[PDB]
Design a protein around this nucleic acid. Structure first.
Ligand SMILES: CC[C@H]1CN2CCc3cc(OC)c(OC)cc3[C@@H]2C[C@@H]1C[C@H]1NCCc2cc(OC)c(OC)cc21
Ligand SMILES: [Mg+2]
Ligand SMILES: [Mg+2]
Ligand SMILES: [Mg+2]
Ligand SMILES: [Mg+2]
Ligand SMILES: [Mg+2]
Ligand SMILES: [Zn+2]
Lengths: 224, 139, 96
RNA sequence: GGGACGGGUGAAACAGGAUGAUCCCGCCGAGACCGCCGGCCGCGCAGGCGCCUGCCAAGACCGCCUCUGUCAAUCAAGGGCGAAGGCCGGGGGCUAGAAGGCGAUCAGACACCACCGUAUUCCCGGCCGUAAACGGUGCCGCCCCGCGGCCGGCGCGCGCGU
């Protein structure tokens, strides 16, 4: 009952994929698509696609600092034969997450819902671990409850104050840098030892239907 | 293939795709996709190259399938790939089979450049009940 | 008679503990009685790590690791040589 | 999207596939569950106890030149709680899975292995009142070699370290 079919790659053509201006290397790559036929149109089918890009490839250099973070972009508008994208979410790699854990320590995980001025609503996730004091007799490094609640409250306060309300471009710049992580750590380190403190990932829950002024804002160098 | 049916050439970089490896306990899958997963360039499996069921996840079949796949994709105009190595997962073994490393070495020795590598095994924060019962496979 | 003072488990100041499934046979075991080991291994076997690194385009790339915890039942640990049957006097030794 | 096998085993064979399967990605629905941290850690009368946020009441321990003044210990009868399975009446329906069915193995296999699958597993109200319900050691009280580890609270000392 088998049949042979013609090669479908004889009616294909590639498009380029472009990144926002916050980053140095703005060529993501290329995507194939079938040439328009009937109702199918390439500029419509390739409209909403999601590309996972490592931060160390978007910003060459700083491999030891950028190689374990990877956010993904979504195309919103096809023009000039090239596809334009904006921010869709951020995450770290799996090996880093697995490496974070060690026996004898405590783990804190927090998430808060963060709205924006542009109408995006985001959920962020923050992870922290306790560490050992320099002259600690005992081997374990657990802590008491009051310390834990202070750490959670401080995380909430810092997140609210630095990310309480912000535009997408500013948030993307902050995430590309690690200043939010720096604030989290120096606020928490004032309470106790902090082995690691960072942002696990960012999710987008709801966004406005039309993002054209935003896309035009993200894709030009000078406005930011 | 006409030139417009292949990726464009430019000195800034090369053609990058991503390969998905399924290193199972019963079969091996080698799959090449675009940067997104919505298009497929080449798909081969270890059961296409052997006659014995128990040999489908063997390394030899994986290598043969990998050579065929690199031939196809090179004809289609792809030179570098990222890697996504994966096990069965899902409240399962969570350990790679024996065909994954053979696939990787076959890609490397086929003149294919390598980008990034990561684990893609589907793991949960919560567990549905697995099979076997509370006494397990007794045999 | 009684063979071990711990009765073959590590259960102190409690009545019940949560259960786990053996990774080989999927038997249900108490968490305090299951044999646990932690492993750290490279995704790529070390024989071809150099080949992969040569093929890699990025500069200064480091091979990722796998972090997993293996949990086995008593029967499966013995059958797979994870633990050994010891002498009467060596049962008290606790060092690895 | 792509085009020929896939699943499963010690090895195989039943169920799936050109009506496009397996594989990749995205969205949608529902119901369970709470991972790595997680322990000669801890809480609870025992049975038992692990997502975020908030609310309600409770409890042992330590510290004290606060109060009362024997108000106590243990217990037939009686009362209350009590794993899992099971039952009655209502809800819900995803995983697994007694009964049942089917493929293998065997001399036989109505069993162990593979696959499908009903009750059940989840919630409310209520019965039942059993377990290797084990530290197989009843409760209250006194004396008692030496060394060490962990948890909670308080005090002393200094060169100020959890
Ligand atoms: C429970 C199913 C039994 C059915 N067979 C008989 C034929 C056979 C021949 C083998 O030689 C290769 C063989 O090697 C693994 C297994 C079998 C199975 C044996 C099954 C009996 C089962 N309990 C007794 C001992 C045993 C040992 C086994 O070796 C690991 C085994 O493999 C899963 C199954 C069994
Ligand atoms: Mg056996
Ligand atoms: Mg005996
Ligand atoms: Mg008990
Ligand atoms: Mg019940
Ligand atoms: Mg008794
Ligand atoms: Zn096991």
């Amino acid at each position: 009952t088998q049949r042979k079919n013609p090669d479908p790659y004889l009616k294909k053509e590639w498009y380029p994929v472009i990144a926002p201006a916050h980053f140095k290397s703005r060529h993501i790559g290329q995507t194939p698509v079938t040439k328009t036929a009937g109702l199918r149109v390439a500029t419509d089918v390739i409209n909403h696609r999601v590309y996972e890009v490592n931060l160390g490839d978007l910003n060459p250099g700083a491999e030891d600092l950028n190689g374990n973070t990877k956010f993904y972009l979504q195309t919103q508008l096809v023009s000039d034969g090239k596809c334009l994208t904006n921010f869709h979410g951020m995450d770290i790699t799996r090996h880093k997450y697995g490496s974070l854990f060690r026996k004898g320590c405590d783990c804190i995980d927090v998430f808060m819902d963060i709205p924006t001025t542009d109408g995006y609503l985001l959920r962020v996730f923050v992870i922290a671990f306790t560490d050992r004091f320099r002259f600690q007799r005992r081997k374990n490094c657990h802590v008491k409850g009051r310390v834990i609640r202070m750490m959670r409250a401080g995380i909430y306060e810092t997140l609210h104050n630095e990310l309480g309300k912000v535009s997408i471009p500013v948030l993307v710049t902050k995430l590309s840098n690690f200043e939010v992580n720096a604030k989290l750590t120096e606020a928490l380190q004032k309470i106790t030892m902090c082995r690691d403190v960072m942002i696990r990932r960012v999710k987008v829950v709801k966004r406005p239907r039309n993002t054209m002024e935003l896309l035009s804002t993200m894709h030009d160098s000078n406005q930011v | 293939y006409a030139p417009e049916n292949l990726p464009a050439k430019n000195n800034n970089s090369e053609a990058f795709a991503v390969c998905h490896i399924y290193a199972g306990k019963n079969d091996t899958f080698i799959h090449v996709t675009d940067l997104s997963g919505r298009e497929t360039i080449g798909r081969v499996s270890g059961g296409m190259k052997v006659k014995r069921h128990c040999d489908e996840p063997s390394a030899y079949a994986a290598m043969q399938a990998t050579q065929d796949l690199i031939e196809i994709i090179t004809d289609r105009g792809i030179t570098a790939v990222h890697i996504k190595i994966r096990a069965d997962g899902g409240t399962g073994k969570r350990v790679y089979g024996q065909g994954g490393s053979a696939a990787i070495r076959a890609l490397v020795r086929g003149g294919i450049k390598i980008g990034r590598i990561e684990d893609s095994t589907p793991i949960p924060t919560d567990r549905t009940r697995h099979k076997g019962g509370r006494r397990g496979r007794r045999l | 008679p009684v063979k071990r003072r711990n009765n073959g488990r590590s259960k102190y100041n409690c009545g019940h503990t949560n259960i786990v499934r053996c990774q080989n046979c999927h038997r249900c075991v108490p968490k305090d009685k299951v044999i646990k080991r932690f492993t750290i291994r490279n995704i790529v076997d070390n024989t071809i790590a150099d080949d992969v690194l040569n093929a890699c385009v990025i500069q200064g790339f480091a091979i990722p690791k796998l972090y997993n915890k293996v949990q086995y039942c008593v029967s499966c640990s013995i059958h797979n040589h994870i633990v050994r049957v010891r002498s009467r006097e060596d049962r008290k030794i606790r060092t690895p």
